[PDB]
């Protein structure tokens, strides 16, 4: 034997901790990059909603003013 068996585990596990550290930096950057680009897609469609609401308000104001 168990003297070899105990030693071989110590590398296997120690090297895995280094790779789980390396893999964990990648998992975050991957998932976070997607929320970066997803939020820009909402901001594009917000401003289009905002400028279309400006056309509504302009459309309302005009048919109120000219009617008086």
């Amino acid at each position: 034997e168990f003297m070899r068996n105990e030693l071989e585990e110590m590398q296997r596990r120690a090297d895995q901790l280094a790779d789980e550290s390396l893999e964990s930096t990648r998992r975050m950057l991957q998932l976070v990059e997607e929320s970066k680009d997803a939020g820009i897609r909402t901001l594009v469609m917000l401003d289009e909603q905002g400028e279309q609401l400006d056309r509504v308000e302009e459309g309302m104001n005009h048919i109120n003013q000219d009617m008086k």
């Binding site: 990059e33 970066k36 680009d37 820009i40 897609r41 901001l43 594009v44 401003d47």
Partner: peptide, 16 residues
């Protein structure tokens, strides 16, 4: 809009 990273930002900053 279907681009990623630095390409998507340029296009949004043009629209705004």
């Amino acid at each position: 809009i279907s681009a990623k990273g630095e390409r998507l930002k340029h296009w949004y900053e043009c629209l705004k």
